[PDB]
Design a protein around this ligand. Structure first.
Ligand SMILES: OC[C@H]1O[C@H](O[C@H]2O[C@H](CO)[C@@H](O)[C@H](O)[C@H]2O)[C@H](O)[C@@H](O)[C@@H]1O
Lengths: 524, 524
């Protein structure tokens, strides 16, 4: 009856650490063996019409179950055979769920199932967990990819994603993508919306043992992650608790915004809570040139890629519902010590490319034989679980300056070239601080802040800081900008880090291409 | 006590039509005489520090006054001396209000009030009306300019303008700006929010007698307008009931949208209700080339420039509050017969130039001696007083096309060049009609409509019609597009008229200037 009917074996979190440790001592298993021909040469239509059998779900036998799970068929870009096991947490005894065609319904699929018959080694691509009131529709957790996984809050819309690990995302060499190659699921308890799933990570450079304790709460999904990592080789770049999102069109430097969509992004900013208590808002970019930024920290308290613009009218996407897509908050649960938060921002021209990658990278160079243990909570939800207790950046608007706000000239372009920055703040003591006097403190790597203005914005009960950036140089070098609000010498806001790309000096001017002629009269 | 203290003279609407018609028999009075030297050479500071004395207001002596009025001082571009009169409607007697310096507080004006002592013929630039509970501050109606005037709804935010008359706005010659040279004010009744103001129009080409019965309602201003017009010369273009708005950056053809404001406009569309009963929604353009359009009609039922996007977040303007600015509806009160609704859209690069002019222009060529009479109601309010009983366009969005919606390529631009149009409809019977089948009927001057899609939009309970436009020709000639929704042989929506400007053939392609280099790593 239960789908998991393989050889019984003892399993616990330490046996997996041993598996992973022992595995690190041998040669990497290498790239996956080709799939059976019937799957190797599949049209998307064909794959898509393969459907896991809902009545053979992982936990079909558990009464009052509030959670169930199904498996994705191997095929398409899923070339790694992920093995799946069921663990009775009472007896610490695991049984393998072997792939078999009986587990699936191949409908209008022209799949030669006969060549799948003895392929009990095929395993699956990954898995999804459903929660009540619907246990076979609208998954809330999905592990499917390499180390990749994602989840949803009460909107049920999937957005940014996370991975078990990142290796060499940005270096002299090509990036390496560790696979999760096996998952052990503790049988859910009747009534529970918490489930436990251990995973084995395997890769040319490194193995790991992972435990995921996953809480499908009413408003969000919380994941208690513990990992143990075993380097096989020297590693150039190790990325702990990595996130992957997309940013094409935002309120900032809008250079890829010729769609019907006012904004296009899965996430709009990096939030960092630093070990010293400082909060940072790093508005994400769609740079024309690939960028890596490393934010030095020690014992980071938290960091996330957030989607805080929840307004459909700002996106107009009735396919992907970007306004419903969630935020991801990484809460270190042990002291991670010295290192950097890496943000890679890749140039994109649409929404098909996850062009945003963020992770933690320990200070210390990774050498063959090094071992690591990280614990962290992930919160999949619209609003992060924590935010600055002070004035918070709500939005970072950028555009032409060189004029007076409200009086942008209609007949000529502006006299001088400048770039306008508008940073709206909403938050704590802004109201009580306002009479006492709010000074923005601005810091620029290059250029001069001019026409600094502080303006009340009734509709969001906040304050807008505008300044015009005037260049001092012919340099196209990135401009690292920094801003916070001050009041009687004390800071009253989070810090805003921005990365501006000044245009070429030949393009620091406007081309006025208008024509005012009696050539275009039309009668209807 | 009252400020009206010139010579008693009989006055009524007939007597003004006589002044106007008699005035037409003589030569135009010509361009205004130079102002006194102190006002000719004024800093905008100096002028702005002149304040009409609220204790000398027009209706200071009326008890239970729900309305009052004040005058604008002559100066700056106010060069025509407008004469102002008070009428007792009981006795049909009218006393002039002569300019006297004592009616104003000059403050830090730096003005030789002594060369303003004798000047009884100076008059004023214009007038404004205030309504309780603020009869000295938030104005609701303002006549100031030439034939120009404007009003506000319960937002109390000024936006687009009207005029008495438009002359030669688009022809071989330069435009002619008739001036309101005198106003007569029926004294307000106690308790009344209706007031009546008569106006004399005077211009090189034409004179006129205007009556404005102006209702300052709770939620809007309604103006009952009657004029009589007396042509002194042949006239190339006569524009009745004209409107003047602005449109810089909307959701359509976003060619001037590099501001911190997602949208900048005082109006977004030309709404027409034709003699035959057909409704038209013509979204306004900010074209790079000056356009005139003439929409043929017979006994037009109504027309207006509407500001239907009420959403602060779509504009982010806290100076001019575009979201609060009103719609203006012209409702002809008699059968105006054959002619054209004229729409001139001038190129702009900001908000300072009113680049939208719309008016009625009768079929018949205007010759000297001609007399005209129009009656129309003006509705200054957010929502026009009447709209299509069918489905209504809510927004016209344009952008890149040639890809599948929601899968815009990230690593390349689209293979082929096309322009995407997305018209959202939010009207009636769309829900009942969807099962029966909603056919979009598209008409194109040039090019072909491919990838035509009908998509339900939950958040506005509406339907989005998208099409890619592919060129058939190397021509840059404007493309008239026309769309309505049909179901079972019947039209179920208003007609959408759009005017598209294809780009030069050499620019019907995308330039891919991305770079993927290790050149830009940054440590903080
Ligand atoms: O399930 C989502 C995708 O996951 C995989 O893709 C990620 O992992 C790959 C490593 O095998 C990377 O090369 C890739 O760039 C990542 O997106 C999977 O292979 C894809 O086909 C899935 O869409």
């Amino acid at each position: 009856s239960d789908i998991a009917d393989g050889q019984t074996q003892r399993f616990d979190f330490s046996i997996l650490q041993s598996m992973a440790h022992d595995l690190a001592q041998t040669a990497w298993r290498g790239a996956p063996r080709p799939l059976p021909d019937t799957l190797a040469t599949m049209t998307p239509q064909a794959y898509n019409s393969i459907q896991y059998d809902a009545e053979k779900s992982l936990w079909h036998n558990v009464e009052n179950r509030q959670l169930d799970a199904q498996f994705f068929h191997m095929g398409m870009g899923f070339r790694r055979r992920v093995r799946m096991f069921s663990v009775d947490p009472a007896t610490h005894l695991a049984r393998e769920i072997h792939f078999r065609p009986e587990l699936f319904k191949y409908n209008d699929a022209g799949v030669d199932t006969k060549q799948l018959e003895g392929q009990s080694d095929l395993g699956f691509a990954g898995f999804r967990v459903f929660k009540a009131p619907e246990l076979a529709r609208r998954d809330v957790v999905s592990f499917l990819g390499a180390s990749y996984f994602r989840a949803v809050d009460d909107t049920y819309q999937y957005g940014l994603s996370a991975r078990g690990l990142a290796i060499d995302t940005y270096t002299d060499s090509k990036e390496e993508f560790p696979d999760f190659t096996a998952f052990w699921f503790d049988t859910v308890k009747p009534g529970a919306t918490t489930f436990t799933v251990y995973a084995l990570l395997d890769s040319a450079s490194i193995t790991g043992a992972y435990k995921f304790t996953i809480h499908c709460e009413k408003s969000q999904v919380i994941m208690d992650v513990e990992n143990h990592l075993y380097a096989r080789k020297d590693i150039k770049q190790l990325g702990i608790a990595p996130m992957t999102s997309m940013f094409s069109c935002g309120t900032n430097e809008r250079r890829m915004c010729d769609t019907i969509h006012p904004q296009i992004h899965d996430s709009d900013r990096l939030s960092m809570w630093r070990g010293n208590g400082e909060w940072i808002c790093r508005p994400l970019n769609n740079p024309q040139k690939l960028q890596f930024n490393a934010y030095t920290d020690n014992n980071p308290k938290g960091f996330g890629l957030l989607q805080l613009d929840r307004d459909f009218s700002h996106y107009q996407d009735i396919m992907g519902w970007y306004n419903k897509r969630p935020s991801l908050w990484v809460e270190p649960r042990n002291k991670w010590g010295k290192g950097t938060i890496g943000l890679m921002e890749i140039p994109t021209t649409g929404e098909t490319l996850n062009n945003i990658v963020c992770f933690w990278q320990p200070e210390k160079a990774v050498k063959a034989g090094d071992e690591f243990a990280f614990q962290y909570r992930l919160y999949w939800s619209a609003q992060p679980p924590v935010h600055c207790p002070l004035a918070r950046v709500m939005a970072t608007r950028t555009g032409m300056g060189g004029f007076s706000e409200g009086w942008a000239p209609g007949e000529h372009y502006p006299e001088k070239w400048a770039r306008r920055f508008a940073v709206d703040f909403v938050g704590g003591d802004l109201k009580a601080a306002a009479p006492k006097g709010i000074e923005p403190v601005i810091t620029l790597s290059s250029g001069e802040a001019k026409q600094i203005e502080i303006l009340y914005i009734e509709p969001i009960d906040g304050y807008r800081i505008q300044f015009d950036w005037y260049p001092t140089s012919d340099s196209t070098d990135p401009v690292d900008m920094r801003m916070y609000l001050r009041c009687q010498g004390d800071a009253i806001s989070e810090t805003w880090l921005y990365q501006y790309f000044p245009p070429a000096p030949d393009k620091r001017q406007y081309v006025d291409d208008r024509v005012m002629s009696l050539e275009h009269h039309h009668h209807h």
